[PDB]
Amino acid sequence: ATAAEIAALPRQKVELVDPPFVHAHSQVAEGGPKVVEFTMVIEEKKIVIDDAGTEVHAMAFNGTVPGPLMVVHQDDYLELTLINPETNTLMHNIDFHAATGALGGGGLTEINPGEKTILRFKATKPGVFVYHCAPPGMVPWAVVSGMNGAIMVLPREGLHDGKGKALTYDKIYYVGEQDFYVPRDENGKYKKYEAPGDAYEDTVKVMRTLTPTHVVFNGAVGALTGDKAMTAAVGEKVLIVHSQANRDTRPHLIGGHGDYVWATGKFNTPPDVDQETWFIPGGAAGAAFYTFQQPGIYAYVNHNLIEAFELGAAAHFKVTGEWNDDLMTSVLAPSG
Amino acid sequence: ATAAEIAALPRQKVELVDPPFVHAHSQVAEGGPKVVEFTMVIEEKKIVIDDAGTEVHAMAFNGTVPGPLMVVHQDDYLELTLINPETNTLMHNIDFHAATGALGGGGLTEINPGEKTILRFKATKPGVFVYHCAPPGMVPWAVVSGMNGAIMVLPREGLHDGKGKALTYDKIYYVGEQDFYVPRDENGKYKKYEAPGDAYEDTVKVMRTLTPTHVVFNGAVGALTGDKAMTAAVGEKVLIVHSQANRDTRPHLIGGHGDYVWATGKFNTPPDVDQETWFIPGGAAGAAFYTFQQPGIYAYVNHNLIEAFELGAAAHFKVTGEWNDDLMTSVLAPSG
Amino acid sequence: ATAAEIAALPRQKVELVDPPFVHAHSQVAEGGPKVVEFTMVIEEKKIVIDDAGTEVHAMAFNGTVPGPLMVVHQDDYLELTLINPETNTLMHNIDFHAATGALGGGGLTEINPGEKTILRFKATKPGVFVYHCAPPGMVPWAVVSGMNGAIMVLPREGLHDGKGKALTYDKIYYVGEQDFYVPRDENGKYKKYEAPGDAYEDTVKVMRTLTPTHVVFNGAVGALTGDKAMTAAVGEKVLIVHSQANRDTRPHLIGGHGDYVWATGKFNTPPDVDQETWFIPGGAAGAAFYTFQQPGIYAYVNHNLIEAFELGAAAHFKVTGEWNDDLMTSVLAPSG
Ligand SMILES: [Cu+2]
Ligand SMILES: [Cu+2]
Ligand SMILES: [Cu+2]
Ligand SMILES: [Cu+2]
Ligand SMILES: [Cu+2]
Ligand SMILES: [Cu+2]
């Protein structure tokens, strides 16, 4: 691909939307290779992550935890303008697991407060991939402070099953999973700090126990439940992209399955099928395709149930439609 | 299928056997779709999990930990009669990962002590699946108190390898692995309680450490050893179903291998081959097929060896037959 | 084959080399089946695992942690002469996950100090496999004290991808990952012991937390960095064999990918492709094949980033060559 050919490719700016929702995109590529442009402003800010007012000084791409899902197609280029406002206190950068070279982009995007940078990379491999901050010397701290997200590089011709049959989803959601390590005082109460740096020592100590105090979806316990449950209808095909930048997770749709699951998150690797519970290793993203068949409220969780129900890794799906008694029926209701 | 068509299907009452054994069944479907009937009584009882007399208040389906393995074929209907004796003190239900709708059946099977219920679901996906109690707000507690098992939904035409060659086993064993979280007093001694509800607060604190005090097969340290070691003979084909409803595991047959391993536990996903150690995520069941080629004692373990030899995750296999010197021989026995 | 036929086979004595290097071998087997001979002397020795000077009484095959990588081809016989010098104090043996029978050879190789033994086994299955000490009663202690390594059984026709295309690497490295559990005093300082036995009780207590104090490559924090960093060049094809005999790991090449990854380590199981982060469960070895495309420094880590950067699981690659601006380019360097 000559130098002229690359400079001639069309440039297209895209407006990002906050997770679990995903920005406008087409499953099958529209036109030839493009340079897809995105801009994200980094925000350091205190967020409350549970019903007890527990705080964390989050480091958030685009102001959200997880950062937004960026979608492009194989062989498109992703051109990110990353802005670090002077109001922030730390140097930040970004590592796209989808990219090749300079530590995923980290070595070329180190920006101090008051600086911005523009990185471009060719998305040569199809699949969902994690992206995260990675300042040399404090990589895990930045990541476990919520500075991570994922992108999806769709095959130019959309998704397909193991047999080559097309798999077109009606809706897509991005569930970013986050392990937080919040310090506690001797009485067991979560501590609060004035500035991000103040919590550093105490936090690394908790991190070393390899035991998170919270494991959440969309940045807080219950963020994807109640009135914020994701939605679908019977017959609707849904793609659920799930990521975990630092620690293993095992997604499970309670009352459902993963009809096709690219557990490694890479589309050239044939998807597993009829999954009850899939596995995504820390530092990766995966994707599950399911066609809902029963209406009702479903729970979507990390299937180490303590992490799901004691630590916060549980989301909900509200599904409309008609019940199918062939698939399931209460022959005899609960009775003495 | 219409309600009328289902009602016209033949019914077959199966009698369950305690793990690791599996009730009589046929690998290849004997005739068209039928309604396979099972009955299980919930028993809240005390179990001793180690040689130090450590106790756990178990919540056991059919009186055992794990609950028994139920076997049907794809597209059969599994009709479960679940009974919660008045002697029990808690509400219980059942979520079948193999089922579709109402949280796996959990939403339609909540039964208080003194009640019973009958659930019927269609086994549309082939493979081994976990089933476990899941009372709202009490989910992980019940599961880690031993209330879980698995079922196997065989393909109508039995098992096959990745190329369609049939795989027929001579024996089948079901190993249910359980992570227990037993509270300790200020002297490191495990605590005992006179009531299930009495140990709740103490147990949740331990559960939050995400560090089990015990990891066992069939409910206790050494359960599947000695009088309970599994058996086989050189030349015999054996399928080992293994589940873990709450935490990851990595099975390994010491001295052998997993010739064919459906690691995700789903039969429409080709099995991995020539496996040394496979992986099953918390919340799932998997299955390995192996043809013994050497006689002698074998150990079967969760290969985090601390979990296997310090925490209790180890079982034994006694194999009869002639030793094969081509495969292995001691050229020079241990000597000066 | 009969004893006579085995005795007639040619024999080749191989000289082992220290990890991450691998002894000379041919990817495509040259000639028919051979009895490949190896010799390893077990050394119980004190090793320093971090910059602070933390000590561990290692139990090391060939004097290194991990033990060296032995390479044979499918259906060759691996004949190991194992020596336990009289200067040692413990009985040792070896379990080859690649072998069939007697606990992987463990039951035939128990040698006391001052003894030796010669074990021979047929390498019937292709792939990388863990080997580790396993004296009944102290199995995990030996392994987490560093007594483990791996072997590679190459297909006689060399490596191929999932579709029959040959995969020939230019160089190979073996990364053995070790989880250590070092006791600490009341000041949180690592403790030193005069003899290995002295540390047993304290170490077992740490092991039970299932939380290693160190997670390292090639025996120590930073062991594969600086002048010991691995090397490659743009266009070079590298195979990275990775093992972990006791605990899970999720390898990731920062700045690159795993073009083909036999995550399970078994060559007859098609490899995953375009991987960002793969997963190797405790008790197994895996291998990733990658063709470098960008020059510069890369980090190779266990992608639970706390384990990589706080606990020690990080290695570096120095790659020579021309930068590819098509794959990645800084449109705008960090600036105001
Ligand atoms: Cu940052
Ligand atoms: Cu990363
Ligand atoms: Cu229950
Ligand atoms: Cu479940
Ligand atoms: Cu040893
Ligand atoms: Cu082993």
Side-chain angles (χ1 to χ4, degrees), chain C residues 25-59:
Chain C
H25 59 284
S26 172
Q27 286 169 63
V28 168
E30 303 168 307
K34 299 190 299 299
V35 171
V36 191
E37 300 168 293
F38 302 94
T39 286
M40 291 198 295
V41 170
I42 301 163
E43 288 302 341
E44 290 174 6
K45 53 193 290 182
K46 296 179 188 178
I47 62 174
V48 169
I49 63 178
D50 65 23
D51 288 8
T54 302
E55 278 186 357
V56 155
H57 282 277
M59 293 184 205

mmCIF file of all heavy atoms in Angstrom, chain C residues 25-59:
data_model
loop_
_atom_site.group_PDB
_atom_site.id
_atom_site.type_symbol
_atom_site.label_atom_id
_atom_site.label_comp_id
_atom_site.label_asym_id
_atom_site.label_seq_id
_atom_site.Cartn_x
_atom_site.Cartn_y
_atom_site.Cartn_z
ATOM 1 N N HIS C 25 18.014 -28.738 17.678
ATOM 2 C CA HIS C 25 17.090 -29.774 17.248
ATOM 3 C C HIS C 25 16.612 -29.460 15.837
ATOM 4 O O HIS C 25 16.852 -28.378 15.305
ATOM 5 C CB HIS C 25 15.870 -29.849 18.185
ATOM 6 C CG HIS C 25 15.094 -28.571 18.274
ATOM 7 N ND1 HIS C 25 15.534 -27.485 18.997
ATOM 8 C CD2 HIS C 25 13.930 -28.190 17.693
ATOM 9 C CE1 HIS C 25 14.676 -26.488 18.857
ATOM 10 N NE2 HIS C 25 13.695 -26.891 18.068
ATOM 11 N N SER C 26 15.918 -30.418 15.243
ATOM 12 C CA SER C 26 15.373 -30.243 13.914
ATOM 13 C C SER C 26 13.856 -30.187 14.063
ATOM 14 O O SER C 26 13.277 -30.988 14.792
ATOM 15 C CB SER C 26 15.779 -31.423 13.029
ATOM 16 O OG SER C 26 15.109 -31.347 11.791
ATOM 17 N N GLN C 27 13.210 -29.241 13.398
ATOM 18 C CA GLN C 27 11.764 -29.163 13.504
ATOM 19 C C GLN C 27 11.143 -30.378 12.833
ATOM 20 O O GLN C 27 10.263 -31.025 13.393
ATOM 21 C CB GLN C 27 11.265 -27.853 12.904
ATOM 22 C CG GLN C 27 11.573 -26.675 13.826
ATOM 23 C CD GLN C 27 11.353 -25.320 13.178
ATOM 24 O OE1 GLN C 27 10.236 -24.966 12.807
ATOM 25 N NE2 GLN C 27 12.423 -24.557 13.043
ATOM 26 N N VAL C 28 11.630 -30.701 11.643
ATOM 27 C CA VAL C 28 11.166 -31.872 10.919
ATOM 28 C C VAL C 28 12.101 -33.005 11.329
ATOM 29 O O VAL C 28 13.318 -32.891 11.195
ATOM 30 C CB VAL C 28 11.263 -31.644 9.396
ATOM 31 C CG1 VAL C 28 11.055 -32.958 8.640
ATOM 32 C CG2 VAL C 28 10.232 -30.619 8.974
ATOM 33 N N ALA C 29 11.537 -34.098 11.826
ATOM 34 C CA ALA C 29 12.350 -35.228 12.259
ATOM 35 C C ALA C 29 13.178 -35.752 11.096
ATOM 36 O O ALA C 29 12.682 -35.911 9.980
ATOM 37 C CB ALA C 29 11.465 -36.331 12.820
ATOM 38 N N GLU C 30 14.451 -35.995 11.366
ATOM 39 C CA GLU C 30 15.364 -36.514 10.360
ATOM 40 C C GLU C 30 15.513 -38.006 10.639
ATOM 41 O O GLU C 30 16.137 -38.405 11.621
ATOM 42 C CB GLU C 30 16.718 -35.799 10.471
ATOM 43 C CG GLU C 30 16.615 -34.273 10.343
ATOM 44 C CD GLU C 30 17.897 -33.541 10.730
ATOM 45 O OE1 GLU C 30 18.421 -33.785 11.842
ATOM 46 O OE2 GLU C 30 18.379 -32.707 9.927
ATOM 47 N N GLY C 31 14.908 -38.826 9.789
ATOM 48 C CA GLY C 31 14.995 -40.263 9.968
ATOM 49 C C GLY C 31 13.860 -40.846 10.788
ATOM 50 O O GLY C 31 12.898 -40.148 11.142
ATOM 51 N N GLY C 32 13.977 -42.134 11.094
ATOM 52 C CA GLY C 32 12.955 -42.807 11.872
ATOM 53 C C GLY C 32 13.075 -42.558 13.367
ATOM 54 O O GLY C 32 13.928 -41.790 13.799
ATOM 55 N N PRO C 33 12.224 -43.203 14.179
ATOM 56 C CA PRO C 33 12.196 -43.080 15.642
ATOM 57 C C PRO C 33 13.554 -43.336 16.278
ATOM 58 O O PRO C 33 14.264 -44.257 15.891
ATOM 59 C CB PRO C 33 11.175 -44.132 16.057
ATOM 60 C CG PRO C 33 10.237 -44.157 14.908
ATOM 61 C CD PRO C 33 11.185 -44.144 13.727
ATOM 62 N N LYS C 34 13.896 -42.520 17.266
ATOM 63 C CA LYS C 34 15.167 -42.647 17.964
ATOM 64 C C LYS C 34 14.946 -42.622 19.461
ATOM 65 O O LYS C 34 13.914 -42.148 19.940
ATOM 66 C CB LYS C 34 16.094 -41.474 17.625
ATOM 67 C CG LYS C 34 16.455 -41.333 16.165
ATOM 68 C CD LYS C 34 17.562 -40.304 15.968
ATOM 69 C CE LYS C 34 17.131 -38.926 16.447
ATOM 70 N NZ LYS C 34 15.948 -38.408 15.703
ATOM 71 N N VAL C 35 15.922 -43.138 20.195
ATOM 72 C CA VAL C 35 15.871 -43.090 21.647
ATOM 73 C C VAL C 35 16.749 -41.879 21.960
ATOM 74 O O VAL C 35 17.967 -41.939 21.812
ATOM 75 C CB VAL C 35 16.469 -44.354 22.289
ATOM 76 C CG1 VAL C 35 16.595 -44.163 23.793
ATOM 77 C CG2 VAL C 35 15.579 -45.549 21.988
ATOM 78 N N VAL C 36 16.118 -40.773 22.350
ATOM 79 C CA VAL C 36 16.830 -39.538 22.663
ATOM 80 C C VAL C 36 17.211 -39.561 24.143
ATOM 81 O O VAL C 36 16.339 -39.673 25.013
ATOM 82 C CB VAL C 36 15.941 -38.304 22.379
ATOM 83 C CG1 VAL C 36 16.774 -37.036 22.439
ATOM 84 C CG2 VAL C 36 15.268 -38.439 21.011
ATOM 85 N N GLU C 37 18.509 -39.449 24.420
ATOM 86 C CA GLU C 37 19.023 -39.506 25.782
ATOM 87 C C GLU C 37 19.360 -38.166 26.436
ATOM 88 O O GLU C 37 20.075 -37.342 25.859
ATOM 89 C CB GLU C 37 20.273 -40.400 25.800
ATOM 90 C CG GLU C 37 19.993 -41.826 25.349
ATOM 91 C CD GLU C 37 21.266 -42.610 25.094
ATOM 92 O OE1 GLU C 37 21.987 -42.258 24.141
ATOM 93 O OE2 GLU C 37 21.545 -43.557 25.854
ATOM 94 N N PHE C 38 18.837 -37.968 27.646
ATOM 95 C CA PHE C 38 19.095 -36.758 28.435
ATOM 96 C C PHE C 38 19.561 -37.158 29.828
ATOM 97 O O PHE C 38 19.220 -38.231 30.327
ATOM 98 C CB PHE C 38 17.830 -35.897 28.614
ATOM 99 C CG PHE C 38 17.201 -35.448 27.331
ATOM 100 C CD1 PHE C 38 16.176 -36.185 26.752
ATOM 101 C CD2 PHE C 38 17.636 -34.286 26.696
ATOM 102 C CE1 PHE C 38 15.581 -35.770 25.542
ATOM 103 C CE2 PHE C 38 17.049 -33.863 25.487
ATOM 104 C CZ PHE C 38 16.022 -34.610 24.916
ATOM 105 N N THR C 39 20.332 -36.276 30.456
ATOM 106 C CA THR C 39 20.828 -36.492 31.804
ATOM 107 C C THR C 39 20.637 -35.195 32.571
ATOM 108 O O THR C 39 20.974 -34.126 32.079
ATOM 109 C CB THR C 39 22.337 -36.839 31.820
ATOM 110 O OG1 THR C 39 22.522 -38.181 31.358
ATOM 111 C CG2 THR C 39 22.906 -36.703 33.231
ATOM 112 N N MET C 40 20.075 -35.292 33.764
ATOM 113 C CA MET C 40 19.890 -34.111 34.588
ATOM 114 C C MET C 40 20.249 -34.411 36.018
ATOM 115 O O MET C 40 19.837 -35.436 36.557
ATOM 116 C CB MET C 40 18.436 -33.627 34.551
ATOM 117 C CG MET C 40 17.995 -33.056 33.225
ATOM 118 S SD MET C 40 16.496 -32.056 33.414
ATOM 119 C CE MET C 40 15.306 -33.339 33.930
ATOM 120 N N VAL C 41 21.012 -33.509 36.628
ATOM 121 C CA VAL C 41 21.392 -33.635 38.026
ATOM 122 C C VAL C 41 20.536 -32.650 38.817
ATOM 123 O O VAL C 41 20.452 -31.467 38.476
ATOM 124 C CB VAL C 41 22.879 -33.280 38.261
ATOM 125 C CG1 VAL C 41 23.161 -33.197 39.754
ATOM 126 C CG2 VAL C 41 23.774 -34.349 37.629
ATOM 127 N N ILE C 42 19.901 -33.146 39.866
ATOM 128 C CA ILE C 42 19.053 -32.328 40.716
ATOM 129 C C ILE C 42 19.899 -31.566 41.723
ATOM 130 O O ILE C 42 20.753 -32.149 42.397
ATOM 131 C CB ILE C 42 18.044 -33.218 41.498
ATOM 132 C CG1 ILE C 42 17.173 -34.007 40.518
ATOM 133 C CG2 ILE C 42 17.154 -32.357 42.390
ATOM 134 C CD1 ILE C 42 16.465 -35.162 41.158
ATOM 135 N N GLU C 43 19.677 -30.261 41.818
ATOM 136 C CA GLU C 43 20.405 -29.465 42.792
ATOM 137 C C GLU C 43 19.467 -28.702 43.726
ATOM 138 O O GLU C 43 18.611 -27.942 43.281
ATOM 139 C CB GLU C 43 21.356 -28.469 42.110
ATOM 140 C CG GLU C 43 22.593 -29.114 41.452
ATOM 141 C CD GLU C 43 23.457 -29.914 42.432
ATOM 142 O OE1 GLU C 43 23.342 -29.710 43.659
ATOM 143 O OE2 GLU C 43 24.258 -30.754 41.973
ATOM 144 N N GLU C 44 19.604 -28.959 45.023
ATOM 145 C CA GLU C 44 18.853 -28.221 46.032
ATOM 146 C C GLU C 44 19.853 -27.085 46.251
ATOM 147 O O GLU C 44 20.995 -27.340 46.632
ATOM 148 C CB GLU C 44 18.684 -29.050 47.311
ATOM 149 C CG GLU C 44 17.734 -30.243 47.150
ATOM 150 C CD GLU C 44 17.687 -31.155 48.373
ATOM 151 O OE1 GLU C 44 18.302 -30.825 49.412
ATOM 152 O OE2 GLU C 44 17.039 -32.209 48.288
ATOM 153 N N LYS C 45 19.443 -25.846 45.998
ATOM 154 C CA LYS C 45 20.347 -24.697 46.126
ATOM 155 C C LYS C 45 19.625 -23.402 46.496
ATOM 156 O O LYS C 45 18.448 -23.243 46.190
ATOM 157 C CB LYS C 45 21.048 -24.486 44.777
ATOM 158 C CG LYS C 45 20.029 -24.378 43.619
ATOM 159 C CD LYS C 45 20.645 -24.483 42.228
ATOM 160 C CE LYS C 45 21.483 -23.271 41.873
ATOM 161 N NZ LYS C 45 22.021 -23.402 40.484
ATOM 162 N N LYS C 46 20.332 -22.465 47.129
ATOM 163 C CA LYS C 46 19.721 -21.176 47.466
ATOM 164 C C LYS C 46 19.789 -20.282 46.235
ATOM 165 O O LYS C 46 20.835 -20.200 45.596
ATOM 166 C CB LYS C 46 20.482 -20.467 48.591
ATOM 167 C CG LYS C 46 20.503 -21.158 49.941
ATOM 168 C CD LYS C 46 21.326 -20.315 50.921
ATOM 169 C CE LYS C 46 21.551 -21.030 52.249
ATOM 170 N NZ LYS C 46 22.388 -20.216 53.193
ATOM 171 N N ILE C 47 18.683 -19.629 45.890
ATOM 172 C CA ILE C 47 18.668 -18.712 44.750
ATOM 173 C C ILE C 47 18.047 -17.397 45.206
ATOM 174 O O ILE C 47 17.247 -17.383 46.140
ATOM 175 C CB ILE C 47 17.847 -19.263 43.544
ATOM 176 C CG1 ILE C 47 16.378 -19.453 43.923
ATOM 177 C CG2 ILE C 47 18.474 -20.558 43.046
ATOM 178 C CD1 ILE C 47 15.484 -19.865 42.745
ATOM 179 N N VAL C 48 18.427 -16.298 44.564
ATOM 180 C CA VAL C 48 17.882 -14.996 44.916
ATOM 181 C C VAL C 48 16.854 -14.671 43.836
ATOM 182 O O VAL C 48 17.167 -14.713 42.655
ATOM 183 C CB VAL C 48 19.002 -13.945 44.962
ATOM 184 C CG1 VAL C 48 18.411 -12.546 45.058
ATOM 185 C CG2 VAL C 48 19.912 -14.230 46.166
ATOM 186 N N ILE C 49 15.630 -14.352 44.233
ATOM 187 C CA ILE C 49 14.579 -14.110 43.249
ATOM 188 C C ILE C 49 14.146 -12.677 42.967
ATOM 189 O O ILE C 49 13.239 -12.461 42.171
ATOM 190 C CB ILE C 49 13.333 -14.927 43.608
ATOM 191 C CG1 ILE C 49 12.774 -14.472 44.972
ATOM 192 C CG2 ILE C 49 13.693 -16.401 43.666
ATOM 193 C CD1 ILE C 49 11.488 -15.214 45.382
ATOM 194 N N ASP C 50 14.770 -11.699 43.612
ATOM 195 C CA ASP C 50 14.406 -10.307 43.360
ATOM 196 C C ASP C 50 15.577 -9.387 43.695
ATOM 197 O O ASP C 50 16.582 -9.837 44.264
ATOM 198 C CB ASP C 50 13.124 -9.923 44.138
ATOM 199 C CG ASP C 50 13.295 -9.960 45.666
ATOM 200 O OD1 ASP C 50 14.437 -9.853 46.163
ATOM 201 O OD2 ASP C 50 12.268 -10.081 46.369
ATOM 202 N N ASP C 51 15.464 -8.110 43.324
ATOM 203 C CA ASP C 51 16.542 -7.155 43.561
ATOM 204 C C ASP C 51 16.874 -6.876 45.024
ATOM 205 O O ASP C 51 18.008 -6.508 45.338
ATOM 206 C CB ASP C 51 16.256 -5.843 42.824
ATOM 207 C CG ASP C 51 16.420 -5.981 41.328
ATOM 208 O OD1 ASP C 51 16.599 -7.126 40.862
ATOM 209 O OD2 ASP C 51 16.366 -4.956 40.618
ATOM 210 N N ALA C 52 15.897 -7.058 45.903
ATOM 211 C CA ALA C 52 16.092 -6.839 47.333
ATOM 212 C C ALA C 52 16.976 -7.931 47.920
ATOM 213 O O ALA C 52 17.593 -7.739 48.973
ATOM 214 C CB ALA C 52 14.757 -6.816 48.048
ATOM 215 N N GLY C 53 17.041 -9.075 47.245
ATOM 216 C CA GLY C 53 17.871 -10.163 47.724
ATOM 217 C C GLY C 53 17.103 -11.310 48.350
ATOM 218 O O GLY C 53 17.695 -12.149 49.017
ATOM 219 N N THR C 54 15.787 -11.351 48.140
ATOM 220 C CA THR C 54 14.952 -12.410 48.702
ATOM 221 C C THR C 54 15.471 -13.772 48.248
ATOM 222 O O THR C 54 15.781 -13.972 47.075
ATOM 223 C CB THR C 54 13.490 -12.227 48.273
ATOM 224 O OG1 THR C 54 13.038 -10.942 48.713
ATOM 225 C CG2 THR C 54 12.606 -13.302 48.884
ATOM 226 N N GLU C 55 15.574 -14.692 49.199
ATOM 227 C CA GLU C 55 16.086 -16.029 48.954
ATOM 228 C C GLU C 55 15.029 -17.103 48.958
ATOM 229 O O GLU C 55 14.017 -17.002 49.638
ATOM 230 C CB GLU C 55 17.100 -16.425 50.027
ATOM 231 C CG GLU C 55 18.511 -15.923 49.864
ATOM 232 C CD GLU C 55 19.429 -16.515 50.929
ATOM 233 O OE1 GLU C 55 18.920 -17.259 51.806
ATOM 234 O OE2 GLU C 55 20.648 -16.245 50.889
ATOM 235 N N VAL C 56 15.309 -18.155 48.204
ATOM 236 C CA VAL C 56 14.448 -19.316 48.120
ATOM 237 C C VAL C 56 15.367 -20.535 48.045
ATOM 238 O O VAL C 56 16.410 -20.496 47.384
ATOM 239 C CB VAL C 56 13.548 -19.252 46.858
ATOM 240 C CG1 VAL C 56 13.125 -20.644 46.436
ATOM 241 C CG2 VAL C 56 12.321 -18.387 47.152
ATOM 242 N N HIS C 57 15.006 -21.591 48.768
ATOM 243 C CA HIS C 57 15.768 -22.831 48.729
ATOM 244 C C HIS C 57 15.136 -23.590 47.578
ATOM 245 O O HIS C 57 14.155 -24.310 47.742
ATOM 246 C CB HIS C 57 15.622 -23.601 50.047
ATOM 247 C CG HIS C 57 16.463 -23.049 51.153
ATOM 248 N ND1 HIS C 57 17.793 -23.381 51.307
ATOM 249 C CD2 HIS C 57 16.194 -22.122 52.105
ATOM 250 C CE1 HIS C 57 18.307 -22.679 52.303
ATOM 251 N NE2 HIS C 57 17.358 -21.907 52.804
ATOM 252 N N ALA C 58 15.690 -23.391 46.393
ATOM 253 C CA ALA C 58 15.166 -24.024 45.204
ATOM 254 C C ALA C 58 15.531 -25.505 45.106
ATOM 255 O O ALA C 58 16.509 -25.973 45.694
ATOM 256 C CB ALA C 58 15.666 -23.271 43.964
ATOM 257 N N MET C 59 14.707 -26.235 44.376
ATOM 258 C CA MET C 59 14.918 -27.650 44.113
ATOM 259 C C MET C 59 14.955 -27.557 42.604
ATOM 260 O O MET C 59 13.924 -27.360 41.966
ATOM 261 C CB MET C 59 13.731 -28.465 44.620
ATOM 262 C CG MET C 59 13.636 -28.434 46.153
ATOM 263 S SD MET C 59 12.329 -29.479 46.801
ATOM 264 C CE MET C 59 11.993 -28.683 48.381
#
